[PDB]
C-alpha cells in the first residue's frame, strides 16, 4: 500500500543517495554530517510502516508497467560497485546511523 507520491514523496530519499556515495566511494560535497542529517530527516519523515519500502526504492527502485526503473536506484560508480553501495544502504536505520525503527 506504500505508494510513492501518496504516502511519501517521489524520489523518496534522494539526499541519502548522495550520502551513500560520499561514505562508500569517498566522493561528494564537503560537510558530510550536514548531508547525513538531511538524509535521516528524509527517512524520519516517512511513516513507520512504509520506511522499509521507501528504503528499498532507494536501493532497487520502482519499475513501471512500461518495464523500466524510475525512482531509484543505486547504480555503478567508478571503483564503487552496486553491491558495495547496497550493503551500507541497509544499515542507514541502525543505531550507529539515523537510529529509526
Amino acid at each position: 500500500e506504500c505508494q510513492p507520491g501518496v504516502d511519501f514523496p517521489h524520489n523518496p530519499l534522494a539526499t541519502c543517495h548522495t550520502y551513500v556515495i560520499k561514505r562508500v566511494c569517498g566522493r561528494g560535497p564537503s560537510r558530510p554530517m550536514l548531508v547525513k542529517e538531511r538524509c535521516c530527516r528524509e527517512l524520519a519523515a516517512v511513516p513507520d510502516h512504509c520506511r522499509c519500502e521507501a528504503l528499498r526504492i532507494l536501493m532497487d527502485g520502482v519499475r513501471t508497467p512500461e518495464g523500466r526503473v524510475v525512482e531509484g536506484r543505486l547504480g555503478d560508480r567508478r571503483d564503487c560497485p552496486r553491491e558495495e553501495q547496497r550493503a551500507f544502504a541497509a544499515t542507514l536505520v541502525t543505531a550507529a546511523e539515523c537510529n529509526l525503527s
Binding site: 510513492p4 507520491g5 514523496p9 517521489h10 524520489n11 534522494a14 539526499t15 543517495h17 548522495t18 550520502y19 556515495i21 566511494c25 566522493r27 561528494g28 560535497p29 564537503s30 560537510r31 554530517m33 550536514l34 548531508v35 547525513k36 542529517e37 538531511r38 530527516r41 528524509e42 524520519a44 519523515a45 524510475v70 525512482e71 560508480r77 567508478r78
Partner: protein, 874 residues
C-alpha cells in the same frame, strides 16, 4: 606505549563524573603524574599521587547538568579537599577501577576555578608593555623575543602565573618586537609533556604564515589612513535594517582576472582602493542602484594559502584554453597544483583577529592592517557598508604540532569539542570549537569587538551559527549595539548580524545547550538564511538529485524528461512550492496568513516543508535572508543550465536567471545575492569550488566570458555528475555571449532601483506585512506558475493605516515563469489607477514594455518569463 582514552569528566573542583557500575564505583582511585611517566606492566606504575575517589549517592546536581546535558545520568565521585586541584590539572591524569583505565576531560573544572575576565594579549601603557596568556594547565610559560621576522632570539623572559593567567610587565621599548610563547604542557594526543612554541590567541598582527606575533599597538597613528578617525561621518546612511541588500564577494575573485589593476595588488586588499578599476566601477554601479552591503568571504588569518607569494604555482592559461569545453584535462592541471596555488575560500581558521597575509602586498610589516582599513574606507566612500564572514564554528588544526595549530597547542582539549570518548568532533568540517566553554565564549565576543572598533566593520555573517551557542550570539549582539561614536568611534546600533542556522550533528536538539539554529534564533533580531524559498525556486535541494525541478525550473510547465511523477503530481508539487515562496516573499513570518493551494487559510508556521519543519519561522522580517545562490553549491546560471530542459536557448535561461534574482530583490525582508548573479556567472557546474583555483572561480569584469565551458570540474567533488555535465558543456548554444551578460546586468540594476523607489517593499514590522501584503492568484482555480503580490498603502479620505509612500498608494508585482504570455483577471484590483513602473517603461528590454493594465476587469497582461511591477500614483 601508554595512550589512554578520555571517558571521565572533571566537572567542578570537587566532583568527577564517570559512567561506571554502581558497585565497581567503590574502588576508584585518582592518579596524577606531572612528568607523565605512567605505564602498564599488571596494574599502574609511575605515579606521583594516589587518592581514593568517594562515590556520591545523590549524583550530579542541577547546576552541572544544565551546562552539560549529554552526561546527566553519569555517576558522581567526590574529590577530597586535601588534593591540590590547581597542581593536578597540570599533570597527566587517569582514573582507574576488571581493570578500567581512562583519562579526564577538564574544561568543566577549568571554568569553575580559572574563569578570567581581565586583560589578555598585549596592553600598552605610557612606559610599559604587558603580556597576558590564559593557560591554567601549563607547567610553565616563557616568551621568546625576536628582533625581526627571521633573526634569532634576543631575550627569554619567564612569566608569573596568577589564577591560571601568565603575566609579565616589560619596558616601552618592547613595542614593535616579534614574539612567541614557550609552553610546556601535557598533550593527551601524544601522551607526553612537550615544550611548544605558540603564537598569541589575542594577536593583532603576524609575520609571514603566522611564524611570529608582532607586538604592535593598534591605536598607532602610523597605522591609520587619512581621516580614519572621522569615518563615522563618512559612512553611508542607514535608517533601518529593512533597507539592507547584501552582495557576497570573495576578495581574490574580485581582482584575480582584472587587467586594470597592478599584479602586486591583484587578489588582495589594495584592489578595492583603486580609483577607476573595472571592479570598483562595477561595485559603484550597483551601489548607485540601491546596493547597501558587501559581504566578503574569510579575511582573517586562515590556513591553506601560503603568504609568501614566491611559492605560488600556476596553470598554463594559454594551453588550457585549447582543450575542449567538456574535457577532463583542465581539472587535472589544477588538482596537481591546488595545494600550493594562491586560491582558497578561507574556511580553515587559525587566528581570528589578524587580517590574512596573502591578501596583503607584504606579509611582513604594517601592510596587512593599513590595506584592510583602506578597503573598508574605500567601500564606504562609494556607499557600501562592509560585512565580514566570521568562522567561529571550527579550527584548521589541532595537537601540539604544526604552524597552523595555536589555540589547541596552548590549552589542549579545551577550545575543541569532544565526544564521550574524548575524540575531537569533526562535524563542522574539522576540529569543532566549543563555544559553551567560558573562555571560548569570551574569545568570540572579544574578536567581534576587535573588528568593530579597530577596523570599523558594519556587520557579520556567522558560518555554521547552529554550532555556536545562542548565549554567545545574544551577548555579542548587546555588546556591538552598546558601542557609541564618542566612546569608540563607531555607531553600534547600525551593525547587523546573520548566519547559517543549520541544526545538525552532536549539537542538534539542544544536546550541548541552546544552539543558534534558525528555530531558536526566532525573535532575536539576528538574521538567518531562508533555505525554504531557496529550494522551492531552484527545485529539490543541493544534496538531492541534480535533475529535480522546481517553481523557476519548469516543474510541471516544462518537464525535462526526469521522472518526478505524473502530471497531477507535478502540478500539485508546483502549487506547493509557490505557497512556500509566497511566505518568503512576505518575510517568511510565523504569523502571516496565506491562502494555500488547497484554499485553506494557513499561518506561516502552520505551512510545513515536505520533510518535517515549519516554513515561516521568524517574528520580524529583518530575521529573513532570502537567497537562491551563494558561494556554496552551484551558481544560479549553473543550476538553471542543468535542471531546465536541454533544448532551450541561452536567451530563455537568461530570463529565468532574472526571475530568481528579482524574486529576491522584490521580497519583504533582506535580499542576498552571490557575486556574478548579475552577469550570469558560471563555475562550469562545480558544486564545491573552494579549492578549484582561479580557473573555475573566474569573475570577468570585461564581460567577455561567464566562465562556462572551461572543462569538467575537479573529480573528487564532481566526478559522479560528469556524464550529465559533459554534453551541456560541449554544446555551444549553452554558452552566452557579451550581449547576454550586459543585458542581464542592466536588468538587475533596474530591479534594485524599483525596490528603493518605494518604502512598501521594505516594511519594518510583522504587523505591517499582515495588513498591507496580499496575494491574489490562490486556491484550486489559480493559474500555475504565476505569483501575484500586492502591497497596500493609506489611500482616499480617512484611511485605516499610516502613509508610508509619498508617490504611490498601491504596488502590484506579477511573477510569471510560463513560456507564454498570461492574462490575469483580479476583481479586487479592478477600477484602480494602475500603470507600469517608470523604470520598466524606459527599460532596455523590449519584451517587458508590452506589460499592460485594464481598469475594467482588473486585467494584468504580463509577458512570458517576465516579472512586472505595477504602481498606482498619487
Amino acid at each position: 606505549a601508554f595512550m589512554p582514552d578520555a571517558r571521565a569528566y572533571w566537572v567542578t573542583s570537587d566532583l568527577i563524573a564517570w559512567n561506571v557500575g554502581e558497585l565497581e564505583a567503590q574502588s576508584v582511585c585518582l592518579y596524577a603524574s606531572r612528568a607523565a611517566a605512567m605505564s602498564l606492566s599488571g596494574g599502574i606504575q609511575g605515579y606521583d599521587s594516589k587518592v581514593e575517589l568517594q562515590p556520591e549517592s545523590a549524583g550530579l546536581p542541577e547546576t552541572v547538568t544544565q551546562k552539560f546535558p549529554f552526561i546527566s545520568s553519569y555517576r558522581a565521585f567526590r574529590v577530597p579537599s586535601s588534593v591540590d586541584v590547581a597542581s593536578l590539572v597540570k599533570c597527566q591524569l587517569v582514573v582507574a577501577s576488571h581493570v578500567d583505565v581512562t583519562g579526564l576531560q577538564l574544561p568543566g573544572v577549568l571554568d569553575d576555578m580559572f574563569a578570567y575576565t581581565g586583560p589578555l594579549g598585549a596592553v600598552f601603557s605610557e612606559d610599559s608593555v604587558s603580556l597576558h596568556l590564559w593557560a591554567p594547565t601549563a607547567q610553565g610559560v616563557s616568551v621568546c623575543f625576536f628582533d625581526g621576522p627571521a633573526g634569532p632570539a634576543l631575550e627569554t623572559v619567564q612569566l608569573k602565573e596568577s589564577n591560571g593567567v601568565w603575566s609579565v610587565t616589560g619596558p616601552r621599548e618592547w613595542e614593535n618586537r616579534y614574539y612567541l610563547y614557550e609552553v610546556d604542557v601535557y598533550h593527551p594526543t601524544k601522551a607526553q609533556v612537550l615544550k611548544c612554541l605558540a603564537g598569541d590567541p589575542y594577536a593583532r598582527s603576524l609575520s609571514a604564515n603566522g611564524a611570529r606575533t608582532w607586538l604592535v599597538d593598534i591605536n598607532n597613528e602610523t597605522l591609520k589612513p587619512a581621516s580614519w578617525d572621522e569615518l563615522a561621518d563618512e559612512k553611508p546612511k542607514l535608517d533601518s535594517f529593512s533597507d539592507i541588500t547584501i552582495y557576497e564577494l570573495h576578495i581574490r575573485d574580485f581582482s584575480a582576472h582584472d587587467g586594470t589593476v597592478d599584479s602586486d595588488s591583484r587578489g588582495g586588499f589594495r584592489a578595492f582602493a583603486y580609483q577607476a578599476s573595472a571592479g570598483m566601477e562595477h561595485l559603484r554601479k550597483l551601489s548607485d542602484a540601491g546596493l547597501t552591503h558587501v559581504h566578503l568571504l574569510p579575511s582573517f588569518h586562515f590556513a591553506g594559502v601560503d603568504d609568501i607569494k614566491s611559492n605560488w604555482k600556476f596553470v598554463d592559461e594559454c594551453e588550457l584554453a585549447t582543450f575542449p569545453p567538456g574535457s577532463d584535462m583542465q581539472q587535472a592541471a589544477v588538482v596537481a597544483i591546488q595545494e600550493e596555488d594562491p586560491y582558497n575560500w578561507g574556511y580553515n581558521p587559525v587566528l581570528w583577529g589578524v587580517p590574512k597575509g596573502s591578501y596583503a602586498s607584504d606579509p611582513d610589516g604594517p601592510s596587512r592592517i593599513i590595506e584592510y582599513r583602506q578597503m573598508v574606507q574605500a567601500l564606504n566612500r562609494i556607499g557600501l557598508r562592509v560585512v565580514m564572514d566570521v568562522v567561529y564554528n571550527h579550527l584548521d588544526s589541532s595537537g601540539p604540532c604544526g604552524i597552523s595549530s595555536v589555540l589547541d597547542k596552548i590549552v589542549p582539549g579545551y577550545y575543541v569539542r569532544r565526544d564521550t570518548n574524548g575524540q575531537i568532533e569533526n562535524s563542522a568540517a574539522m576540529n569543532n570549537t566549543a563555544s559553551e566553554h567560558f573562555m571560548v565564549d569570551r574569545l568570540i565576543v572579544d574578536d567581534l569587538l576587535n573588528w568593530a572598533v579597530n577596523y570599523k566593520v558594519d556587520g557579520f555573517r556567522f558560518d555554521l551559527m547552529g554550532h555556536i551557542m545562542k548565549r554567545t550570539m545574544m551577548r555579542a549582539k548587546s555588546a556591538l549595539q552598546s558601542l557609541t561614536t564618542d566612546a569608540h568611534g563607531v555607531d553600534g546600533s547600525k551593525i547587523y548580524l546573520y548566519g547559517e542556522g543549520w541544526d545538525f550533528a552532536e549539537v542538534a536538539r539542544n544536546q550541548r545547550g541552546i544552539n543558534g539554529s534558525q528555530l531558536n534564533m526566532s525573535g532575536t533580531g539576528i538574521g538567518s538564511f531562508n533555505d525554504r524559498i531557496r529550494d522551492a525556486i531552484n527545485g529539490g535541494n543541493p544534496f538531492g538529485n541534480p535533475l529535480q525541478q522546481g517553481f523557476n525550473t519548469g516543474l510541471f510547465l516544462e518537464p525535462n524528461g526526469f521522472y518526478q511523477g505524473n502530471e497531477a503530481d507535478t502540478r500539485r508539487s508546483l502549487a506547493t512550492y509557490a505557497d512556500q515562496i509566497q511566505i518568503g516573499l512576505a518575510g517568511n513570518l510565523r504569523d502571516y496568513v496565506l491562502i494555500s493551494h488547497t484554499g485553506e487559510a494557513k499561518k506561516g508556521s502552520e505551512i510545513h516543508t515536505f520533510d518535517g519543519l515549519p516554513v515561516g519561522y521568524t517574528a520580524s522580517p529583518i530575521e529573513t535572508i532570502n537567497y537562491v545562490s551563494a558561494h556554496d553549491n552551484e551558481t544560479l546560471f549553473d543550476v538553471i543550465s542543468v535542471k531546465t530542459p536541454m533544448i532551450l536557448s541561452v536567451d530563455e535561461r537568461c530570463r529565468i536567471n532574472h526571475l530568481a534574482s528579482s524574486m529576491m530583490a522584490l521580497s519583504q525582508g533582506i535580499p542576498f545575492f552571490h557575486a556574478g548573479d548579475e552577469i550570469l556567472r558560471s563555475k562550469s557546474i562545480d558544486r564545491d569550488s573552494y579549492n578549484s583555483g582561479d580557473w573555475f572561480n573566474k569573475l570577468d569584469f570585461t564581460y567577455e566570458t561567464n566562465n562556462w565551458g572551461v572543462g569538467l570540474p575537479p573529480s573528487e567533488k564532481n566526478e559522479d555528475n560528469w556524464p550529465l555535465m559533459k554534453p551541456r558543456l560541449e554544446n555551444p548554444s549553452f554558452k552566452p555571449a557579451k550581449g547576454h551578460i550586459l543585458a542581464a546586468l542592466d536588468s538587475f540594476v533596474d530591479i534594485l532601483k524599483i525596490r528603493y523607489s518605494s518604502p512598501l517593499f521594505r516594511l519594518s514590522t510583522a504587523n505591517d506585512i499582515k495588513q498591507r501584503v496580499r496575494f491574489h492568484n490562490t486556491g484550486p482555480s489559480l493559474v500555475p506558475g504565476v505569483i501575484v503580490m500586492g502591497i497596500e498603502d493609506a489611500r482616499g479620505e480617512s484611511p485605516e493605516m499610516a502613509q508610508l509612500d509619498t508617490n504611490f498608494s498601491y504596488v502590484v508585482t506579477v511573477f510569471n515563469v510560463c513560456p507564454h504570455e498570461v492574462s490575469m483577471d483580479i476583481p479586487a484590483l479592478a477600477s484602480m489607477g494602475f500603470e507600469l513602473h517608470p523604470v520598466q517603461v524606459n527599460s532596455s528590454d523590449t519584451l517587458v514594455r508590452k506589460s499592460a493594465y485594464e481598469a475594467a476587469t482588473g486585467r494584468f497582461t504580463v509577458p512570458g518569463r517576465t516579472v512586472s511591477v505595477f504602481v498606482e500614483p498619487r
